[PDB]
C-alpha cells in the first residue's frame, strides 16, 4: 500500500522544507541534494512544483542549477517538464545572454507536440541575435526542432534564416551551422542544401581556416558531398584544403584526406599535381600512427582502404607499419594485414624477416596470425616462396607446438599452390608427426601424405597412426584421411590392401554420419569395378588456386572511398546496412 | 534520547566526500579513545552514549579495534539503556579475547541467575545472536532448566526456547537428549500461542535427527490445528491476520508433521485429513477482503496443507481436490501464485494417484504458456509438459509445443527444442508421425537441432522411407522463404538428391528450379554444406540429365575448382571428371540407391 | 550524431548518463552493459555495431566512457571529442575513480551540458570553460637471486593454472561460479635480467571475492615488471567472479513415474571453439540409496554403475567444442520405505581445458638483459594455459 | 531457517542488517552487493522468489525501500513475505508511520524490534498487539 511515504518526517521532508529557506546560499546545497537524489535513483518527483518556485531568482548559478535539474527531468519525462513553459518562454530574452542560450536550448530539448507553438516564437527570435554564442546555440536548436516532428512550414523561413547564417561572422558559428544543415540534409528533400558553388564555397574555404578544432570536420564533410566540373576548380579546392596536418590529429587529417581522394579526378600527368598529392598524402598517413591506440584503430582501418585504391603512395612505407610489442592486439592486427598487402618483392628482405621475428611472442593468436602472414607473403610475391618455407622450416624446428599447427597448415597451402618445388622437406614434416592435435593441421599433414606418396617408403605406418583412433576425430581428418588413402591406394598398390578395407569400412560400417556414408560407397564401387578408371577420376591435376577472396569490391570501394572519414569505412560496409 | 548521537549522525549525512566523512569518523574515534584512556573514571550515561557512537561507526563499514572495556563494564549496570546498548555491542562486534569471553560469560551466568525477565531477556538474545563454543560450555547446560520451570515468565519461555534451537544448531555435541524432553512437548498446549510458535519450532528442529523421541508431539499438533482452522473469526483476535485465524502457527505445525510418517492413531489420522479438508474448503469461498494480504497469507496454508498431502501421499480424494484447486490457480493475477502452483504441480506430476488429474488441466497450463510474460513461469510451465506427457497425450502435447515454436522467444528454444526431440524419440508410435514431428523442428529452428538427430531422421527414411514427397515438398517449399537455414539445407540436399524423382512432377517442382534452389542456398552455406550440395549434384546428373550442362557449367567456374579449401575443389574435380568424361553409363554403377543402413 | 554519453564504474552499473535523440531508449545501455563490458569471447574493438547501432568506448583505469550512436557518424571525431573529455575531467578533478565522480556529479552534469549540444561537439578547451562552467569540483588524495648464474642457452616457460568453480540450477541460472589461478613462471636465464609482462584486463589489481596477490619481487607502476628468481616459483595469486567462460553447461531431465521408476538423461553441451579439447572428462550422477539397479545407453565415452559410491559414473576421453551428447539412464527402485522423499544431490563433472576460463591471456613479454649482450628476441619462450574442474555441480 | 535480513534502498546503502550465520566482514558486503544487484532490476509483474547462491530471496518493495530475506531454499515462501509485510506494520505501527530516515536515527531500537519478532534465524512472535507492548513497556524504563 502506502507506507514509507509520508512527507512529515524523512529525506524528502526535509528537503522540501529546506527548499523554501530565505537565504538563497541555503537553497544552493538543497537543490543539489536535489540533483544527487536524482543521479542516485531517488525518486524526488514530489520536489518538482517548488523547485521551480526556485526559478524566480536573479542568480545566474540557481538559475542554472534548476536549467540542469528541468534538463534531468525534459528526456524522461516530458510531460512533467512542460510545466514549466511559461517560465521558459519568460526566459529567452533576460540580460545575461548565457540564460539566453540556456533557456533556448532546454526549450529545444523538450520533445513533446505542442512545444512549436510554444518555441516558434522565441527560437525565430533568437536567431537574429547580437550574441554569437546564442546563435551557436539556436542554430542547433533548429535541427532539434526539425528530429522532432515538424516540417511546419514555417521550417522555411528558419531554413531561409539558416542559409543566411553560413554567412556569419564568428567562425563556431558556422562551425556548428553547417553540421546543423548537414544534418537536416540527410532526411533527404531532394531539394535541399544547394551549393552556390563558387561564392558559398570561396566563404566557406575562407572561415575554414579560422574555425575552432571542430568545426572544420563538418566544413569538410560538407564540402565532401560537393560535386565538382572542371579542372581548375578541383585544382583551387585542393590548394586551399591542402595545410591540414592539423591539432585534432584524428578527425582535420582523416577528414581532409577524404575531401582529397574524392577530389582526385584530373589530368594525371599533363600537370605535376597528381604526383604533388601523391606525395603530400604520405607523412600524415603515417604520423597518424603516433597518436592514440584508437585513433591508430582508425586510421589504420581507413589506410588499408587507401592501399586497396592507390597503393602508388605508400608503396615505400613498410617500416613504419611494424608491430611494436607493446600494442594492442586489435592494432596488431591491422598493421599485420598493412603489412601483407604491402609486401612488395624488394623489401620482403625484412618482411619474411620480421614475421619471423613475431613468431617468438607469447600472444597466441597474433602468433597464429603472423604465421598465416608469412604464408599468404608466399603466395604475393613468388620469387620469395623458397626463402619462405626455409623460414618455415626454421619455425617448425623450434618445435613450439601451437607454432608448428599453423606452420604445416601454411606449408600444405604452399605446396598445393607451386607444386613439385619443396619435395625434400617432407620427409622432415613427418619427423613432427606426434606433436599434432588441432584438426586444421592433422587434416594438412594428412593431405601433403596424401600427395607425395611415392616420396616417403614409410607413408603406410604414417596414415595407420591415425586409423586406429578414427572416431573423437572431426570429420574434416575423416573425408581427407579417406582420399589419402584411396590415394596412396592407387600410387601403391599391393601394399595398401591392409589399408583400403578396414580404411573404407571403418568409414561406411561404423560411422553414422551419412555423408562419410555416401564418400565411402563412392569410392568403393569405383575401386571395385576397374582400377583403369580410378586413375584418371581420382589422379587428375587439381588446376592452380588462387585467394580470390583478398581482395575488395572495386564499387563498392568507390563507395567507401567517397565515406573515408565516417563511421561507414571501420566496418568496411555500406551505410544502408545500418540506418 | 541522546542529542549528541543524532547531531553526530546529522553531521555524517551531511559529509561532501568520502574523505571529509572518513576524517570526521578518525576525529571521533581519537576523542573517544582519547576520553576512554583518560585517567578520570566514567558515568554510566557517557559511557552509554560512547558506545552507540562507536557501534554505529562500525555499522557504517570502517574499523574499530576497542571500546569491548566498556561494553564489557556496562553489563554490570541496572538501568535497562545501559544494558541494552551493551548486550547490543557485544553482540555485533566478534572478537576472541579469552579474558573478555570470561567477563561476559561471568555477566551472563549473574543476569540468568536474576529475576526480572527483562534482562533475562537481553541475555538470551545475546546468547543467541553470538552462539560462539564457549557460551555453548557456559550455558547449554542450563538452558532447558530455564525453559522447564514452571514460574518463567512468558517472553522467557519464548527466547529461551529459540537460544536453545541456536545452540542446537551450532554445537550438537553440547546438548544433551536427557529429561526436559517431556515438558518441551507438553508446552504445546500454552494459551500464548507464541509459546506454541517457539516450541514448535525446535521440536520441529530437534526431531530433524531423533524422531522416535518426539512422537509423541503429533496429536498435540493434529488438535492445536483442528482448533485453529474451525475457529471463529472474532476467536485469536491477538493472533489473527487478515481475517485468517493464526497462519504462521498453522505453518510451523504442518512443517512438523511433514518431518514424521502418517500418524499412527486412528482417530488423529481423520481429525487431521478432516483439517486438511477443511483448509481446502475454506480455499474455495469468496475472498472477504479486496487486499492481497488475506489472498496471500490463506494461499500459504493451502500451499502448505498440499504439500503436506504430497509428504503423505496417501489421501488419494485429497490429492485430485488439491490438484484441482490448484489448476483453478493458473490463471490468476497474482504471478506469485501462478509459479507457485506450477511449481507444486511439477512434483505432483509424480503421483500414481494424481496423474490423470494433472492431465485434465492440459488446456490450462498450455494456454497459460502460449501467453505468459515471465520467463521462469514458462520454464516451469514447458517442464510441467514434461511431466506429464505419456503414452495418451504425447500427439497434442508435442504438436502444440512446435506450434508455440512457430513464435516463441529466443530464451526457451533451446529446451523446447530438445524436449521434443526427445519426446519424438520415446513415444514416437509411427515413422511418419516421428519424421513429421523431426523435419518440422528442423525446418522451424534447426540451429539449435542437434548433430545426432538429423542423422537419425535420415536414418530412419533411408530404411522405411514411404515420406519422400513429403519430406522433398516440405524441404521444397521451407526453402524459398529467404530465410532457411543449414540443418535443413543439409538434409534436405541430402533427401531430395536421393529421392527428387518423387517430387519432379509438379510443375513447380522442376530439376532445373530443384537446382535454383539449391544454388540459391549455395553461396550463403558453409564448407560441409557445400560438399553434400556437390554430392547431390552428381545424384541429379545421374538422373536428370536436363541440367546436365548448366551444372557443369558451374562446376567448371573459377569459383569451383580454384576453390580455397581442399575437399570441395577434391570432390569437384571428381565429379566432373566422372560426369563429363570417363564415364556416361557406369555412374549408374556408382551413384546407386545407397543400401539401407544396417541395423547397430 | 552523438547519441548518447554514458559513464560506468567496473561493476557496471551506470555512475551518470545523458543522453541526446530520443532514437536511443533503456535498450541501448542495457545492451552496452550485456554486449560489450560483459562480453566473454568476443574479440574487441573500440567500435562495435549491434541491433543496427554503435558503440565508442574508452577505458580510463577503471571507468568505462561510452558514447552511443545510430547516425554513420564521423569516427575519428568520436575518439578525439572522448580523449578531450577525458582531459577536461582530469583537469578539473585529477585521476578518475569512482569516488571523483561520485563526489563531482553536479560538475559532470555542467561538462556534459556545455561540452556537448544535442551531439555536436562545441569548442571544449579548459581554458574557456570557465565562461559557462560556475561549479568547482573537489580533488582529493634483491637477495633472492644469486648473481653469476650461467646458462648456455636461454629458455622460459609461463604456465597459467586456473581452477573453476561452478553450481548451476535446472533451469540453467547460473548461482554461483569464480575461478582461482596463478601464474607460476619456469626460467632458465644467465644473469641478472630485466623482464616487462603484461596481461589483459580480466584480473583487477565459502564466498568467492576478488583478489590478486604477487610475489615479494613484483613491481607495479597496467604492466609488471620484475627479475625473476632462478628455478621455478609463484609469480601472483588470484581470483575472479565474473564473466567466466563455463566450458561445458549440463542439462539434466529427471522424470520420476510412480514410487519405482525413476528415468533421468543428461545432455552436456561444449561453449567453446571447435578447433580446441576439452581432455579426461568425468560425469558423476547421483542416484538415491535405494537403487536396486540401472539401465544406462551412451554415445560418447562410457559410463557404469558405482553401488558402493552411490553414483553413476561416465567418462570421456576428449571431446571437441561446440557439440552435443547425450546420456539415457533408467532406474529402477526398491519399494522398502513408503517414505523419504530422496532431495536428489546435485550432478558433479570434472575436466581440464586448454584455455583459461577466467578470460585471462598474457599479452606479451619482454627481457632485457643490460650488461650482457642478449634480449628477448634470443630466448624462446613456451605458454600453457591449464583451466580445471574444482566443484563443478549442477542442481538436477 | 532465515539467513540474513535487509532494509536496503535504491541507493544501495543498507538501512539494516542482520545476519544469522558465521560470515566475515568482507564477505558480508560481498553478499550485500550481489543482493542489491539482483533485486533492483525487477518490476512489480515480476515474483518476489528470486534463486540465490545456495538459498533464495523473499523480497519486497515499499516505495523507498526495500525489504529482503533469506530463506532456505527448502521453506515456505509466501509466509515469509507476509512475516515481512507483518514486521513492516509493526515498524510503522511504533515510529509512528516509520521513514528511513527514522531507521537510521534509531537503530539501536530497530534492532531491539528485529530480535523480539525474530531470534536465531525463526519467526518468535507474531502478534503485534503483544510486541507493541512489550515494546511501549521497555520504552518507559530510565
Known amino acids: 500500500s502506502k507506507y514509507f511515504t509520508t512527507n512529515k518526517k524523512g529525506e524528502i521532508f526535509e528537503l522540501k522544507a529546506e527548499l523554501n529557506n530565505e537565504k538563497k546560499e541555503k537553497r544552493k546545497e538543497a537543490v543539489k541534494k536535489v540533483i544527487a537524489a536524482m543521479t542516485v535513483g531517488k525518486d524526488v518527483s514530489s520536489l518538482f512544483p517548488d523547485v521551480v518556485n526556485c526559478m524566480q531568482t536573479d542568480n545566474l548559478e540557481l538559475k542554472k542549477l534548476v536549467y540542469l535539474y528541468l534538463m534531468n527531468y525534459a528526456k524522461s519525462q516530458p510531460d512533467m517538464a512542460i510545466m514549466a513553459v511559461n517560465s521558459f518562454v519568460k526566459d529567452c530574452e533576460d540580460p545575461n545572454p548565457l540564460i539566453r542560450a540556456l533557456a533556448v536550448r532546454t526549450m529545444g530539448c523538450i520533445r513533446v507536440d505542442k512545444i512549436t507553438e510554444y518555441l516558434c516564437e522565441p527560437l525565430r527570435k533568437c536567431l537574429k541575435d547580437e550574441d554569437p554564442y546564442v546563435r551557436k546555440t539556436a542554430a542547433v536548436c533548429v535541427a532539434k526542432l526539425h528530429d522532432i516532428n515538424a516540417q511546419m512550414v514555417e521550417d522555411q523561413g528558419f531554413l531561409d534564416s539558416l542559409r543566411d547564417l553560413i554567412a556569419d561572422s564568428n567562425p563556431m558559428v558556422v562551425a556548428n551551422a553547417v553540421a546543423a544543415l548537414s544534418e537536416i540534409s540527410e532526411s533527404h528533400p531532394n531539394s535541399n542544401l544547394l551549393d552556390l558553388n563558387p561564392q558559398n564555397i570561396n566563404k566557406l574555404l575562407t572561415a575554414l581556416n579560422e574555425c575552432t578544432e571542430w568545426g572544420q570536420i563538418f566544413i569538410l564533410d560538407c564540402l565532401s558531398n560537393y560535386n565538382p566540373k572542371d579542372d581548375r576548380e578541383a585544382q583551387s579546392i585542393c590548394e586551399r584544403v591542402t595545410p591540414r596536418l592539423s591539432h585534432a590529429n584524428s578527425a582535420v587529417v582523416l577528414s581532409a584526406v577524404k575531401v582529397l581522394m574524392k577530389f582526385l579526378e584530373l589530368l594525371p600527368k599533363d600537370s605535376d599535381y597528381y604526383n604533388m598529392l601523391l606525395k603530400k598524402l604520405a607523412p600524415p598517413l603515417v604520423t597518424l600512427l603516433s597518436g592514440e591506440p584508437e585513433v591508430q584503430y582508425v586510421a589504420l582501418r581507413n589506410i588499408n582502404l587507401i592501399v586497396q585504391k592507390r597503393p602508388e603512395i605508400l608503396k615505400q612505407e613498410i617500416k613504419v607499419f611494424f608491430v611494436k610489442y607493446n600494442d594492442p592486439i586489435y592494432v596488431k592486427l591491422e598493421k599485420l594485414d598493412i603489412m601483407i598487402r604491402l609486401a612488395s618483392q624488394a623489401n620482403i628482405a625484412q618482411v619474411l624477416a620480421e614475421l619471423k621475428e613475431y613468431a617468438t611472442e607469447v600472444d597466441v593468436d597474433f602468433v597464429r596470425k603472423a604465421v598465416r602472414a608469412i604464408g599468404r607473403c608466399a603466395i604475393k610475391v613468388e620469387q620469395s616462396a623458397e626463402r619462405c618455407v626455409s623460414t618455415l622450416l626454421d619455425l617448425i624446428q623450434t618445435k613450439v607446438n601451437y607454432v608448428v599447427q599453423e606452420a604445416i597448415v601454411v606449408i600444405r597451402d604452399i605446396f598445393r599452390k607451386y607444386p613439385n618445388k619443396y619435395e625434400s622437406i617432407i620427409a622432415t614434416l613427418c619427423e613432427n608427426l606426434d606433436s599434432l592435435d588441432e584438426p586444421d593441421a592433422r587434416a594438412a599433414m594428412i593431405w601433403i601424405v596424401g600427395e607425395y606418396a611415392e616420396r616417403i617408403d614409410n607413408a603406410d605406418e604414417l596414415l595407420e597412426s591415425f586409423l586406429e583412433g578414427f572416431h573423437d576425430e572431426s570429420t574434416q581428418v575423416q573425408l581427407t584421411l579417406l582420399t589419402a588413402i584411396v590415394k596412396l591406394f592407387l600410387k601403391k598398390p599391393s601394399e595398401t590392401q591392409e589399408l583400403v578395407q578396414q580404411v573404407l569400412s571403418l568409414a561406411t560400417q561404423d560411422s553414422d554420419n551419412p555423408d562419410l556414408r555416401d564418400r565411402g560407397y563412392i569410392y568403393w564401387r569405383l575401386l571395385s569395378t576397374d582400377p583403369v578408371t580410378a586413375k584418371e577420376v581420382v589422379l587428375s591435376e587439381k588446376p592452380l588456386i588462387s585467394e580470390e577472396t583478398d581482395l575488395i569490391e572495386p564499387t563498392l570501394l568507390d563507395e567507401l572511398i567517397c565515406h573515408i572519414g565516417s563511421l561507414a569505412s571501420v566496418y568496411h560496409k555500406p551505410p544502408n546496412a545500418f540506418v | ?600 | 550524431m552523438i547519441g548518447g554519453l554514458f559513464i560506468y564504474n567496473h561493476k557496471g552499473e551506470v555512475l551518470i548518463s545523458r543522453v541526446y535523440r530520443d532514437d536511443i531508449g533503456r535498450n541501448a545501455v542495457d545492451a552496452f552493459r550485456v554486449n560489450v563490458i560483459h562480453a566473454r569471447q568476443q574479440v574487441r574493438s573500440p567500435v562495435t555495431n549491434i541491433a543496427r547501432t554503435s558503440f565508442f568506448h574508452v577505458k580510463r583505469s577503471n571507468i568505462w566512457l561510452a558514447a552511443v550512436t545510430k547516425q554513420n557518424v564521423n569516427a575519428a571525431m568520436v575518439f578525439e571529442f572522448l580523449y578531450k573529455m577525458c582531459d577536461v575531467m582530469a583537469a578539473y578533478f585529477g585521476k578518475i575513480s569512482e569516488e571523483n565522480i561520485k563526489n563531482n556529479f553536479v560538475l559532470i552534469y555542467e561538462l556534459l551540458d556545455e561540452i556537448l549540444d544535442f551531439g555536436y561537439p562545441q569548442n571544449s578547451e579548459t581554458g574557456a570553460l570557465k565562461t559557462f562552467i560556475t561549479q568547482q569540483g573537489i580533488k582529493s588524495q634483491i637477495g633472492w637471486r644469486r648473481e653469476g648464474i650461467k646458462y648456455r642457452r636461454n629458455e622460459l616457460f609461463l604456465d597459467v593454472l586456473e581452477s573453476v568453480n561452478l553450481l548451476m540450477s535446472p533451469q540453467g541460472q547460473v548461482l554461483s561460479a569464480h575461478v582461482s589461478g596463478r601464474v607460476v613462471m619456469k626460467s632458465y636465464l644467465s644473469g641478472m635480467p630485466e623482464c616487462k609482462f603484461g596481461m589483459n584486463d580480466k584480473i583487477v589489481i565459502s564466498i568467492a571475492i576478488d583478489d590478486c596477490t604477487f610475489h615479494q619481487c613484483v613491481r607495479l607502476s597496467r604492466s609488471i615488471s620484475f627479475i625473476p628468481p632462478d628455478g621455478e616459483f609463484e609469480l601472483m595469486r588470484y581470483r575472479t567472479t565474473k564473466d567466466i567462460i563455463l566450458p561445458f553447461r549440463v542439462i539434466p531431465l529427471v522424470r520420476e513415474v510412480g514410487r519405482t521408476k525413476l528415468e533421468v538423461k543428461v545432455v552436456i553441451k561444449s561453449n567453446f571453439k571447435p578447433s580446441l579439447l576439452a581432455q579426461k572428462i568425468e560425469v558423476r550422477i547421483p542416484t538415491p540409496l535405494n537403487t536396486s539397479g540401472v539401465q544406462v545407453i551412451c554415445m560418447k565415452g562410457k559410463a557404469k554403475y558405482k553401488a558402493s559410491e552411490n553414483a553413476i559414473v561416465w567418462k570421456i576421453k576428449r571431446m571437441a567444442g561446440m557439440k552435443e551428447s547425450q546420456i539415457s539412464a533408467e532406474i529402477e527402485l526398491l519399494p522398502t520405505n513408503d517414505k523419504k522423499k530422496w532431495a536428489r544431490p546435485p550432478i558433479s563433472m570434472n575436466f581440464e581445458v586448454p584455455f583459461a576460463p577466467s578470460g585471462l591471456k598474457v599479452r606479451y613479454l619482454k627481457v632485457f638483459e643490460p650488461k650482457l649482450n642478449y634480449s628477448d628476441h634470443d630466448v624462446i619462450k613456451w605458454v600453457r594455459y591449464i583451466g580445471r574442474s574444482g566443484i563443478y555441480e549442477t542442481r538436477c | 531457517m532465515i539467513r540474513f535480513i535487509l532494509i536496503q534502498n535504491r541507493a544501495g546503502k543498507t538501512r539494516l542488517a542482520k545476519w544469522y550465520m558465521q560470515f566475515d566482514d568482507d564477505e558480508k558486503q560481498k553478499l550485500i552487493e550481489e543482493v542489491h544487484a539482483v533485486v533492483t532490476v525487477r518490476d512489480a509483474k515480476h515474483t518476489n522468489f528470486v534463486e540465490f547462491r545456495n538459498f533464495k530471496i523473499i523480497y519486497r518493495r515499499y516505495a523507498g525501500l526495500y525489504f529482503c530475506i533469506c530463506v532456505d531454499v527448502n521453506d515456505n515462501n509466501l509466509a515469509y513475505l507476509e512475516a515481512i509485510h507483518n514486521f513492516v506494520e509493526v515498524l510503522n505501527e511504533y515510529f509512528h508511520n516509520v521513514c528511513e530516515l527514522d531507521l537510521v536515527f534509531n537503530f539501536y531500537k530497530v534492532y531491539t524490534v528485529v530480535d523480539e519478532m525474530f531470534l536465531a534465524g525463526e519467526i518468535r512472535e507474531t502478534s503485534q498487539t503483544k510486541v507493541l507492548k512489550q515494546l511501549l513497556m521497555l520504552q518507559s524504563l530510565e
Open chain 2, 1 to 600: 534520547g541522546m542529542r549528541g548521537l543524532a547531531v553526530f549522525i546529522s553531521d555524517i549525512r551531511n559529509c561532501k566526500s568520502k574523505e571529509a566523512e572518513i576524517k570526521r569518523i578518525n576525529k571521533e574515534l581519537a576523542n573517544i579513545r582519547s576520553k576512554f584512556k583518560g585517567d578520570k573514571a566514567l558515568d554510566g550515561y557517557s559511557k552509554k552514549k560512547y558506545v552507540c557512537k562507536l557501534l554505529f561507526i562500525f555499522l557504517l563499514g570502517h574499523d574499530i579495534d576497542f571500546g569491548h572495556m566498556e561494553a564489557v563494564n556496562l553489563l554490570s549496570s541496572n538501568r535497562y539503556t545501559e544494558k541494552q546498548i551493551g548486550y547490543l555491542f557485544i553482540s555485533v562486534l566478534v572478537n576472541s579475547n579469552s579474558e573478555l569471553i570470561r567477563l561476559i560469560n561471568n555477566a551472563i551466568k549473574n543476569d540468568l541467575a536474576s529475576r526480572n525477565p527483562t534482562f533475562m531477556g537481553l541475555a538470551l538474545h545475546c546468547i543467541a545472536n553470538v552462539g560462539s563454543r564457549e557460551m555453548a560450555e557456559a550455558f547449554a547446560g542450563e538452558i532447558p532448566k530455564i525453559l522447564v520451570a514452571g514460574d518463567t515468565m512468558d517472553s522467557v519461555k519464548q527466547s529461551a526456547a529459540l537460544c536453545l534451537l541456536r545452540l542446537y544448531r551450532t554445537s550438537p555435541d553440547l546438548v544433551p537428549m536427557g529429561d526436559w524432553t517431556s515438558r518441551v512437548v507438553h508446552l504445546l498446549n500454552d494459551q500464548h500461542l507464541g509459546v506454541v510458535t517457539a516450541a514448535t519450532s525446535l521440536i520441529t528442529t530437534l526431531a530433524q535427527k531423533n524422531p522416535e523421541e518426539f512422537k509423541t508431539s503429533v496429536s498435540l499438533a493434529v488438535s492445536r490445528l483442528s482448533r485453529i482452522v474451525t475457529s471463529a473469526s472474532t476467536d485469536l483476535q491477538d493472533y489473527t491476520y487478515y481475517f485468517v485465524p493464526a497462519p504462521w502457527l498453522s505453518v510451523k505445525l504442518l512443517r512438523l508433521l511433514q518431518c514424521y510418517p502418517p500418524p499412527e492413531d486412528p482417530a488423529v489420522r481423520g481429525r487431521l485429513t478432516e483439517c486438511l479438508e477443511t483448509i481446502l474448503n475454506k480455499a474455495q469461498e469468496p475472498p472477504k477482503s479486496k487486499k492481497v494480504q488475506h489472498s496471500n497469507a490463506k494461499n500459504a496454508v493451502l500451499f502448505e496443507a498440499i504439500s503436506l498431502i504430497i509428504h503423505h501421499d496417501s489421501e488419494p480424494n485429497l490429492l485430485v481436490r488439491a490438484c484441482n484447486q490448484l489448476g483453478q490457480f493458473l490463471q490468476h493475477r497474482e504471478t506469485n501464485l501462478r509459479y507457485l502452483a506450477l511449481e507444486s504441480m511439477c512434483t505432483l506430476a509424480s503421483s500414481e494417484f494424481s496423474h490423470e488429474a494433472v492431465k485434465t488441466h492440459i488446456e490450462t497450463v498450455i494456454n497459460a504458456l502460449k501467453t505468459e510474460r515471465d520467463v521462469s513461469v514458462r520454464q516451469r510451465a514447458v517442464d510441467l509438459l514434461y511431466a506429464m506427457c505419456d503414452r495418451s497425450n504425447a500427439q497434442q502435447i508435442v504438436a502444440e509445443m512446435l506450434s508455440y515454436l512457430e513464435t516463441a522467444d529466443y530464451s526457451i528454444r533451446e529446451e523446447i527444442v530438445l524436449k521434443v526431440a526427445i519426446l519424438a524419440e520415446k513415444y514416437a508410435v509411427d515413422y511418419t508421425w516421428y519424421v513429421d514431428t523431426i523435419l518440422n523442428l528442423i525446418r522451424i529452428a534447426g540451429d539449435y537441432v542437434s548433430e545426432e538427430v538429423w542423422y537419425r531422421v535420415i536414418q530412419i527414411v533411408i530404411n522405411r522411407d514411404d515420406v519422400q514427397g513429403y519430406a522433398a515438398k516440405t524441404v521444397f517449399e521451407a526453402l524459398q522463404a529467404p530465410a532457411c537455414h543449414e540443418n535443413l539445407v543439409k538434409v534436405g540436399g541430402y533427401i531430395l538428391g536421393e529421392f527428387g524423382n518423387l517430387i519432379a512432377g509438379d510443375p513447380r517442382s522442376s530439376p532445373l528450379i530443384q537446382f535454383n534452389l539449391l544454388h540459391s542456398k549455395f553461396h550463403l552455406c558453409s564448407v560441409p554444406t557445400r560438399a553434400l550440395l556437390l554430392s547431390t549434384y552428381i545424384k541429379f546428373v545421374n538422373l536428370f540429365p536436363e541440367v546436365k550442362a548448366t551444372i557443369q557449367d558451374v562446376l567448371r567456374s573459377d569459383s569451383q575448382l580454384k576453390n580455397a579449401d581442399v575437399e570441395l575443389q577434391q570432390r569437384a574435380v571428381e565429379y566432373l571428371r566422372l560426369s563429363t568424361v570417363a564415364s556416361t553409363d557406369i555412374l549408374a554403377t556408382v551413384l546407386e540407391e545407397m543400401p539401407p543402413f544396417p541395423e547397430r
